[PDB]
Write a protein that binds this ligand. Sequence first.
Ligand SMILES: NC(=O)c1ccc[n+]([C@@H]2O[C@H](COP(=O)([O-])OP(=O)(O)OC[C@H]3O[C@@H](n4cnc5c(N)ncnc54)[C@H](OP(=O)(O)O)[C@@H]3O)[C@@H](O)[C@H]2O)c1
Ligand SMILES: NC(=O)c1ccc[n+]([C@@H]2O[C@H](COP(=O)([O-])OP(=O)(O)OC[C@H]3O[C@@H](n4cnc5c(N)ncnc54)[C@H](OP(=O)(O)O)[C@@H]3O)[C@@H](O)[C@H]2O)c1
Ligand SMILES: [Mg+2]
Ligand SMILES: [Mg+2]
Lengths: 411, 412
Amino acid sequence: RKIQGGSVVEMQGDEMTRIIWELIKEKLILPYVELDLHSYDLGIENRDATNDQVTKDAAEAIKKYNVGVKCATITPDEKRVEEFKLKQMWKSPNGTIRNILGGTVFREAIICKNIPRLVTGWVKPIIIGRHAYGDQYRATDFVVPGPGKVEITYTPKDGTQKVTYMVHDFEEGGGVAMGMYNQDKSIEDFAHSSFQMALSKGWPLYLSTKNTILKKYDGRFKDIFQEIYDKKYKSQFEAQKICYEHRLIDDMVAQAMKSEGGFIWACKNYDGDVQSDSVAQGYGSLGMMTSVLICPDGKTVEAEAAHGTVTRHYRMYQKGQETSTNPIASIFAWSRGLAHRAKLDNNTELSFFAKALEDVCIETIEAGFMTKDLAACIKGLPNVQRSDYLNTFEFMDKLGENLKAKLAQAK
Amino acid sequence: SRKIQGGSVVEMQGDEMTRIIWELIKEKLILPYVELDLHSYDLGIENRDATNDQVTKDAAEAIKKYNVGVKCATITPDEKRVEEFKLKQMWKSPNGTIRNILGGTVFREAIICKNIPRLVTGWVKPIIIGRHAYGDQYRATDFVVPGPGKVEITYTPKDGTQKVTYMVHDFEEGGGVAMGMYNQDKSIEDFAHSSFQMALSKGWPLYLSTKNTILKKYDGRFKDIFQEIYDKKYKSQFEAQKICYEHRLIDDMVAQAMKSEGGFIWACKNYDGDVQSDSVAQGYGSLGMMTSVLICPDGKTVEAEAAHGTVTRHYRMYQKGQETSTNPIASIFAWSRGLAHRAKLDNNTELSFFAKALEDVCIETIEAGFMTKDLAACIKGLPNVQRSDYLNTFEFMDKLGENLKAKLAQAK
Ligand SMILES: NC(=O)c1ccc[n+]([C@@H]2O[C@H](COP(=O)([O-])OP(=O)(O)OC[C@H]3O[C@@H](n4cnc5c(N)ncnc54)[C@H](OP(=O)(O)O)[C@@H]3O)[C@@H](O)[C@H]2O)c1
Ligand SMILES: NC(=O)c1ccc[n+]([C@@H]2O[C@H](COP(=O)([O-])OP(=O)(O)OC[C@H]3O[C@@H](n4cnc5c(N)ncnc54)[C@H](OP(=O)(O)O)[C@@H]3O)[C@@H](O)[C@H]2O)c1
Ligand SMILES: [Mg+2]
Ligand SMILES: [Mg+2]
């Protein structure tokens, strides 16, 4: 028989990651697990065909069933509009989903003992907690076509004072302008999730902002974190001999670079996006990073890879050129989603399966079978020969055989 | 005097640890050898408070007049600084004020010593960041939203045509924060030109990072302006020099930079240039080993500075009687880069030599094994550093002064 899995929302994506997603389902998931699978095609063509409604439907399903696993998707700009003959420049599906669900996206490298790092000192993990809501990812931006005034206005619902602020008087020429925002409740949730994560690991917590420049906007993040620390977590931190500190973002990225690792890093939405790619690459590869959205309700999660659709590799695939794209992050999206589904349902056999999936990945790499990005970590990209790595399909096949043998040997 | 006649330089004095080092540089390395027409503006936090920040605006206008400014790091106050100095207001960053007036691109690059290991294994060639100096978060209008209500952003054309209003957010429960920011086409164009010109002058490829998939209009404008200027002015020159230009999304770019061998110009928007220049400095060795020069669009006016701040944490050690070992090199190169530009403008051969000698002394001293604790930790690892591995802040300044005196004496 197969493992009885329960309800999981699956979102299919684009380009190289869509292909890998198909390989993962066929070789690693479907032969072993039967799921009540609620599938949503978030491929760019289906999003366009449905006027992006499929994205909103998917987010609602994640809230209902509490577990989503998402493949990387194209976020279109003008070049993608021309490529796919799109009706609109659709918004990022990740931004739409995260805007609805809220929460914190936690990202962490996937570590193999035989893979050298690019950053010499990082002997312990760095976990980024990326605030998943607002800021640049729900902004209202526009081109200023010529001379004129841009202003921003707040009108309270309760008929107290309305306030209009000058953004800029464009005296010559035009430019660009934007408004963005965040919400107190969302920032509070983000603080709680950061403090709880630090206590769960027994590691210090650092929050980064630029509150010397954005004194009101970023100052609010710093103030809410400090109030929540003092009122809810200071004594527990002191019990575990860990600390909480706010640092300016430019100081903090330098401190991270020279650290030994072993800390939680609470990042605003944009910083979390950018620095999670820097951290993933510092440890090894973007293909070796986990990403999980933990919603404030303590039960809903969305797992994904931190990287995109790997367009550059897909262009090689389209030309029939051999590719070696790392599928591990995509595989860990499935394993982390299934592990959460099993934790919610006390599903012992699914818990075992999800862990075995992750173990097979690490064991395969550490035994010396890997894609080109990891071979380059070991050898250096100049010294990498074709015999040092497997292409994407050979690697998927090797994982498939190693998983089959692990599940067989366990029963 | 028989000193080098150096000409007119605008000096802005600063705060905390860098203020201490700044005075040591002037007394030990500059004033013994160079006579300057020095236009000094005290941008210390107490004097900015006493002048209601007017000293900062006056300094910026002086840089416009004399074309050369050298700036010490300054405190940008938040609420805690208001309390510590009993400030009248939460003053704006002086860097932001000066850059907003001058415009241009801030170019940042590590200062490389052959005996100093990197934290990033692959960076064998230089990475030069060109940070757009104007606008975005550093000229933003931000505010607390005290409760439910609507935030909207409006554009009113100057020529009387129809005003446009866009919703930013309808706050339905609780409050939050909101902000507006902007940038100007002319400033973006100047940023593009300076970036393409730096790439051609160094002979390296150029990369622009944005997040135009998310900020499709705002960041798309940067991407479009760069591409149109590249196509119509620089592409044939790039191809002749066998270099290229590419736009990349910022999160891809930071990973590409991490695994690269170096050897590229990196055009960054104001905020990214701020953050990633600290990441790059640390990756090569230390925040104390990075140059920073604002190059204005007029092709004549520059403001040189260190990329790091006032090093408050070391200043607190100094205040409590604990030995400090703060790296002065970036501050020294602020002087040397400023004086080099002064000399280029004036065709002042002796001053050009002096400015280069100053930089050579710094490198030669560290390579000879005399260095502050940050660089000793690069070599040994911080847990293995012993007091005999490094010099304290004043000892290192003295050693630089001895070596500079000796170099200039031999030169004659
Ligand atoms: N979560 C998401 O849905 C998400 C995230 C980011 C971007 N995107 C979309 O993805 C598309 C491509 O964006 P992008 O090219 O900037 O970013 P990307 O897909 O993350 O790829 C950037 C580069 O990182 C490396 N890389 C990433 N994932 C890898 C993997 N699994 N194995 C090996 N190398 C890997 C490759 O470097 P080399 O070229 O050096 O081999 C690749 O070209 C865009 O349409 C973007 O909107 C979506
Ligand atoms: N250019 C400017 O005017 C400028 C730039 C940035 C910040 N600031 C102001 O500077 C003040 C302090 O900011 P901050 O603490 O975030 O940043 P910072 O002054 O850059 O110092 C951050 C940390 O970087 C290291 N570091 C920086 N410069 C160093 C040097 N020359 N030698 C050795 N180590 C060095 C030290 O790390 P360790 O503690 O690990 O030794 C230091 O504590 C704030 O008031 C801020 O507004 C101004
Ligand atoms: Mg990203
Ligand atoms: Mg900075």
